Structures are given as structure tokens and as C-alpha cells.
From a paper:
In humans, the Atg8 family comprises six proteins grouped in two sub-families - Microtubule-associated proteins 1 light chain 3 (LC3A, LC3B, LC3C), and γ-aminobutyric acid receptor-associated proteins (GABARAP, GABARAPL1 and GABARAPL2). All receptors described to date interact with these Atg8-proteins through a conserved tetrapeptide motif called [name] motif ([name] Interacting Region). The integral outer mitochondrial membrane protein Nix has been found to be essential for mitochondrial clearance during terminal differentiation of reticulocytes. Our cellular, biochemical and biophysical analyses, including a crystal structure of the LC3B:Nix-[name] complex, revealed that the [name] phosphorylation status is essential for the fine-tuning of the LC3B:Nix interaction and crucial for the initiation of Nix-mediated mitophagy.
The crystal of a chimeric construction containing a phosphomimetic (two Ser were substituted with Glu) Nix [name] motif (Nix residues 28–39) fused C-terminally to LC3B (residues 2–119), Nix-LIRS34,35E-LC3B2–119, was obtained using PEG/Ion Screen 2 condition No. 10 [8% Tacsimate, pH 4.0, 20% (w/v) PEG3350]. The asymmetric unit of the Nix-LIRS34,35E-LC3B2–119 complex contains two molecules (molecules A and B) and the Nix [name] portion in each molecule interacts with its symmetry-related molecule (molecule A and B bind to symmetry-related molecule A and B, respectively). The binding mode is similar to previously reported [name]/[name] complex structures. The hydrophobic interaction surfaces of LC3B consist of Ile23, Pro32, Lys49, Lys51, Phe52, Leu53, Ile66, and Phe108 in molecule A, and Ile23, Lys49, Lys51, Phe52, Leu53, Leu63, Leu66, and Phe108 in molecule B. These LC3B residues interact with Trp36, Val37, and Leu39 of the Nix [name] in both molecules. The electron density of the N-terminal Nix region (PPAGLNEE) is weak compared to other regions or invisible. Given the weak density, the B-factor of Glu34 is higher than that of the overall structure (60.5 and 24.6), suggesting that Glu34 might be flexible in solution. Therefore, in the [name] bound state, the Glu34 residue very likely exists close to Arg10, Arg11 and Lys51 of LC3B and interacts with these side-chains. In our X-ray structure, it is Arg10 side-chain participating in intermolecular hydrogen bond to the phosphomimicking Glu34. Based on the crystal structure, we propose that Lys49 of LC3B shows a similar gating mechanism since the Lys49 side-chain in our structure also moves by approximately 6 Å relative to the free protein. We present here the first atomic detailed structure of phosphorylation-based regulation of interactions between mitochondrial autophagy receptors and Atg8 homolog proteins.
Author numbering:
A (entry chain B): 10 to 134
B (entry chain A): 9 to 134
The structure:
């Protein structure tokens, strides 16, 4: 009654922090200026406690990079021990084809907004 | 409905007629892996067309950055057109308004369900 609570207590994902048309606009600008890159959002699964939070959320991935190279890149950015379990979920599932360019993966897995969303965790769910 | 179907003269098969939907889905998979920064474009002459010649080659891997207005110039040159000859490059039956955006951008709005981008060239806009 005395103090007014603003916003919602829970951390918002990227998708949740931006309007659908903001997102669609962000992608337009990327496809226009970085036409050989794929726009990828990369977030730590909500309940995660073994893995650190990435420094950044918004990435541009060269068409040619495959999922296994991406996994290795993110493991290194996060400075993981080689023994630490790590999964990179694309729409809630690990990708089977880890040697196909992300430009191809993008065509099957991209969101309606044009972004490709990934979530990393120490369990595969 | 008692109206007649006036069949066209069967000519050379188009790309979709030569290949099944699954062979084309498979072709796109290969091509996307082999050329991740290119768009696979099928470019064929409008079946009704008289003014413009037929090009020998119909299957083009276009670099993502290339725009529609660069692509048009490429095709007008391969056809060896006179500079006054009307020419249109139709995507799903229409001229593209956006003529200095990357073809990779176009692709995402206009691609066929099989994953190829189809175009048809004509001396009228239809």
C-alpha cells in the first residue's frame, strides 16, 4: 500500500523483453547489413547452477559455422572445465546434425520472428 | 462448368516438372551445405514469352549480398538484350519493390516450400 511494486520480479528473456515487431525489425536490419550471418540468441536455462551466465546474449554466427564448432566456442567463452557436461538446446532439443552449417539449421529451427533461439544447460532435459 | 480447357503446347520441362518435391528438398539440402552463403535461384522464361530468348542456364547460386537490381543486370547481359528492351524478373508472379536488399533477405519472404527461390523473366509485368 505504501510502496508501489513496478515490473515483474522474474528476469525476462530477450524474447520477453522486446515486442514482436521490435524483434522482426532487429532481424530485418541484420539480414540487410550482415546477409551471410545468422542472428542467434543464446541464454542460460532458468534453473541452471553449474554453468556460468554468458557475458552477452545476442550473437552473429557465420553461415558456415556448424553446431559442434559453436558448442566449442561457447564452452570456451564460458571457460568450462573439459569434464563439465554442456548441452545447447535449440527449441528445447539438442541438434543431431552437428556438422551442418547453421544457415541450414536456421531454416528448420528459426523462430517466427526470424531469430534462432538457443538455451544451454548441464542437463539435456 | 462446360467451358473448354485450352491446353498449352507441351514444351521443355521446367525445374519443378523435372524433379519431385522430395528430390528438390534433397537438392536444397545438399546445396545449402555446399554453399552456405549463396541462395539457390531457379530462373526460367515465362512460358508465354515471345520477345525474349531462352537462356541455356537456369540454375544460379547467387551470393547472399547481391540485390535484385544487380541480378536483373546479370540476366539482361546473359540474354544480350538491347538496352531499350522491356524486361522483368518476377518472384511468385510479381516484381520485387525492394531492389537494393540482399537476395538472402528476399529468399526468406519469397522462397518456395521446397527451399528454392523461383523466378520467371518476361517482357511484361503480368
Amino acid at each position: 500500500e505504501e510502496w508501489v511494486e513496478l515490473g515483474s520480479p522474474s528476469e525476462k528473456t530477450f524474447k520477453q523483453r522486446r515486442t514482436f515487431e521490435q524483434r522482426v525489425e532487429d532481424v530485418r536490419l541484420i539480414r540487410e547489413q550482415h546477409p551471410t550471418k545468422i542472428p542467434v540468441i543464446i541464454e542460460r536455462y532458468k534453473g541452471e547452477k553449474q554453468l556460468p551466465v554468458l557475458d552477452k546474449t545476442k550473437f552473429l554466427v557465420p553461415d558456415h559455422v556448424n553446431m559442434s564448432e559453436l558448442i566449442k566456442i561457447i564452452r570456451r567463452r564460458l571457460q568450462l572445465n573439459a569434464n563439465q557436461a554442456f548441452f545447447l538446446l535449440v527449441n528445447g532439443h539438442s541438434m543431431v546434425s552437428v556438422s551442418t552449417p547453421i544457415s541450414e539449421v536456421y531454416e528448420s529451427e528459426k523462430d517466427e520472428d526470424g531469430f534462432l533461439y538457443m538455451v544451454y544447460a548441464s542437463q539435456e532435459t
